[PDB]
Structure formats: structure tokens, C-alpha cells
Design a protein around this ligand. Sequence first.
Ligand SMILES: CC(C)C[NH2+][C@@H](CC[C@@H]([NH3+])C(=O)O)C[C@H]1O[C@@H](n2cnc3c(N)ncnc32)[C@H](O)[C@@H]1O
Ligand SMILES: [Zn+2]
Ligand SMILES: [Zn+2]
Ligand SMILES: [Zn+2]
Length: 246
Amino acid sequence: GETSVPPGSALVGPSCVMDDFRDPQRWKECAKQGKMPCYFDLIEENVYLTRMQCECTPLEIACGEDCLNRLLMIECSSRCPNGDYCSNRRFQRKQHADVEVILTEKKGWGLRAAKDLPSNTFVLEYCGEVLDHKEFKARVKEYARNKNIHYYFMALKNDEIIDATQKGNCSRFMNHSCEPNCETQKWTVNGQLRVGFFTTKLVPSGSELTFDYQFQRYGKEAQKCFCGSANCRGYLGGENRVSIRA
Ligand SMILES: CC(C)C[NH2+][C@@H](CC[C@@H]([NH3+])C(=O)O)C[C@H]1O[C@@H](n2cnc3c(N)ncnc32)[C@H](O)[C@@H]1O
Ligand SMILES: [Zn+2]
Ligand SMILES: [Zn+2]
Ligand SMILES: [Zn+2]
């Protein structure tokens, strides 16, 4: 039939907002109604189970692209020459991009840009429980036995795996794309390695934020990939990195 501009529609039961992730009672209400994802423990920094001073002239960006710390993926300290105005303390100040959580047709929940994000914009820290090999192997078996639909593991370093299944932040919702618009970067903050999502191109407002989910991509089992990209590899998992054998 003939289509028309719809009338203005207001909700009656108030809509769920991003600040409701810091409000457990409202979140659990919204989740029952399917207006928010299943509850998890929102954490501000990683939970463990088991010097560097730039030459930036005090200030049009304070500790911009030429900052000797930034160049090595090291954050500045409170002693930075630019003091409070240092732009290279993003993890410490939790200077996350403007993001919104969305419900996708096929992949579950996801993350979208709420503003245009330039290339190499800090999106969010990937926070979770930091697991040793033993705990990781146990939880892999635990999650497999429970038939978990989604995975939230990310390697931090060769002996440490972040698990955001139970505890983390909204970065846990990031979905895989075969042609992604974000990457992870591992930054040193007060001597401790932390991992965050960063855009790899200009991401326009309203676009889903996506990454190459390496943990699953190179794992043994596979699943249908719903990324929709022009050169989608068809499935996620069961792949090996390039090698030249024999
Ligand atoms: C390490 C973190 C960032 C990993 N974050 C989850 C998001 C779950 C979130 N959607 C939800 O609802 O809580 C990955 C899982 O999401 C699914 N997922 C993603 N991208 C898919 C694709 N392109 N095709 C199919 N499933 C795809 C898959 O199960 C993956 O393990
Ligand atoms: Zn600097
Ligand atoms: Zn600085
Ligand atoms: Zn794909």
C-alpha cells in the first residue's frame, strides 16, 4: 500500500537508556521486557583472580600524535607536562566514545557509534576477569557444557585471558565482522597492559562498531557469520592464520 510519514509516537513505559547499565534494578526490569540485554556485573577496571615521561611542550592537542608515550602505546601519568589537559590518559579517565547498545537481527546485542568517530578513536576498554591458563581451561569447559551462545574471551598476553562473560562493560557486546571498523590495541597504563577497542576508519554516527574476533576466528569450531560484509568469509571459526608449510 501507499506509505506515509508515521505519526509521532511516545512510549508509555519509559525507555531504557545507557545510564541504566549503572542502575541494576532498572536494568533487570528492562531485561525481563527484552529492552536490555541479560544482566552482568558492570566493572570499572579488570579484576585479577590469581617512569615514562614524554617531551611534549605544555600547551591544538595536548600530547597529540607526536607524543613519545602515545607513539609507544604508553599512557601518560599525572606528572605529564600537560597536567590535567593531557589527551593521552584515555583509559585512566575512561574517556570512552559515545556508544549505544543495539539489538541486531541475527547476532544478539551489539554496539553502535552515537557520533561520527574519527579513525583511531578510543571506543571502550575491554574489561573483564583476567584468567590464568588453568582458570581459562576450566571456564572453556564450563561454558561449553552450559551451551553458551556467545563468547567473551580475549587474550591480553600469552598467559592472561580476559573473560567478560560474568563481569565487564558494554564492550562485551562488540560483534565480529569480516570487514571490521575497529581493532584492539594493547596499551601500558601505570605499567599494566590493558586492551581497548579503537576505530580503524571514520565510523559515521549510527554505524555498528565491529572487530575481527580473533579468539573465535582461529578456534577449532565454526559458526555461520552474519556480518553481511561484501567479502564475508561465510563462517566464523575453523580458520588458521597464513602459513607456508613443510
Ligand atoms: C570479545 C567480545 C567483544 C565478543 N563479543 C560477543 C558479542 C555478543 C553479543 N552479540 C551479545 O548478544 O551478547 C561475540 C559473540 O557474538 C556473536 N557474534 C558476533 N559477531 C557475530 C557474527 N558476525 N556472526 C555470528 N555471531 C556473531 C557470537 O556468538 C560471538 O561469540
Ligand atoms: Zn606527551
Ligand atoms: Zn601527556
Ligand atoms: Zn562475515
